[PDB]
Design a protein around this ligand. Sequence first.
Ligand code: CL
Ligand code: CL
Ligand code: CL
Ligand code: CL
Ligand code: CL
Lengths: 258, 258
Amino acid sequence: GMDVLQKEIDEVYATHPTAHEALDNGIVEQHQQFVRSLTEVNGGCAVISDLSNRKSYVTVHPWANFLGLTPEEAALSVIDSMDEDCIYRRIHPEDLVEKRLMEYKFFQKTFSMSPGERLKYRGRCRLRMMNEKGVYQYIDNLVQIMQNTPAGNVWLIFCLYSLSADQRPEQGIYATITQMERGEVETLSLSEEHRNILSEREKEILRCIRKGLSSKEIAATLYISVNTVNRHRQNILEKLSVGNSIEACRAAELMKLL
Amino acid sequence: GMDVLQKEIDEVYATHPTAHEALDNGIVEQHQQFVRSLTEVNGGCAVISDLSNRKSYVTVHPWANFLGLTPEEAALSVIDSMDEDCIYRRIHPEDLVEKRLMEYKFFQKTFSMSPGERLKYRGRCRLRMMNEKGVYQYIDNLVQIMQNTPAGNVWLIFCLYSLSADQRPEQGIYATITQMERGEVETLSLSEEHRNILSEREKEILRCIRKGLSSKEIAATLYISVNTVNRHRQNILEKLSVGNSIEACRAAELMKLL
Ligand SMILES: [Cl-]
Ligand SMILES: [Cl-]
Ligand SMILES: [Cl-]
Ligand SMILES: [Cl-]
Ligand SMILES: [Cl-]
């Protein structure tokens, strides 16, 4: 599925050598029980991402119809990514880009702080997610460091989804980073980083591809080599987590990257 | 402390008597452990009202400085009421009126539904609360039925307070009632009920008191007896949870009830 900043976020995770520690699993079990209880109150969905083994534990409540998951996708309990992949597919493509930007800023910030301090922070936003009838509804999303390892590395990351009290439209996902103790709520302005997911050269190449030019025509019109065009094309496929150029075109348009 | 609708809300609670039931305390204990684990994630405050014994179990996290509590007031874990008075005092007085109106509508709706259905609803709002430095900040507040008794009565009500991601001012507390499984968020319009907490005759009587008229003089101007004036006065004191007519005038002004 289309996505952004996957490489960059994995790089932040790679700054903590969590997978090298001998960790107690009973801690993860206690958190899994808490998250099931919480979903029984909010009627939503919880994901616990475990950096020690790169696995996700997903809990979906029967009342979480706003996710629009199929019977088979709801039956999941353990995903093999740091992301709950079929939940992400349900997010409006424009909102997914902003979510990714907030997560990257949030993890950059929290991973470079002390273990005790990083726990006082929370990243939040309000996303559009599509239900079973293809209608977008507004969902409150939380990202938060839940547990650290004894040696101070990030161990568990907590993600939460629930139907928001606010169903009114507004431009963007109103991303925020909150420091709970100091009572500080920082609003993120994501517009400029969004416009820069793709470089200007990558955007030109994609507009040519969409228009119907061949590598040879693109090289002719942008005064670059066919080798270079194909280097950019392949970079774009990686940046947008898609498999071919027609897929890249649809992703760029849906996510409003051009 | 000044408040509204305390009699009306207590009457709603009284519609679900449970004295005849022998209830399992182990159930309450599990909810208390959950609510503690939750506050350790949202850095906030949880109140569980137990309608069976009319006690409240209050948990305040150390990072919940947005509450403005003093050290002694935070130490509290079992309040002897259906609500902890030290929390409500911190709520902006105008926001308090709307909060009670939402709760009253929420309870009236839920207490008339089946045990299974009433669990699918959430009452939410965004309140102003005064912190340790005397500044108002925005707090997300939740009211939800958490547990019914075997015979079908409301047993435990769950309230939650945490620092909102939205710190932008707006007219009112944006009170909502959400049906989680149907994905339905109903916005409440509370202005007409707010203006009707006091009757027109009760408002007239309070203006005279503020103006300095005695009961005898109020009786002459309105052409009613002193017995009648004094019954209205006592009714007003009860409606506003205050002890005298000076406190009543001040409360009506601060809560914008005149
Ligand atoms: Cl829905
Ligand atoms: Cl928002
Ligand atoms: Cl604060
Ligand atoms: Cl006299
Ligand atoms: Cl009379």
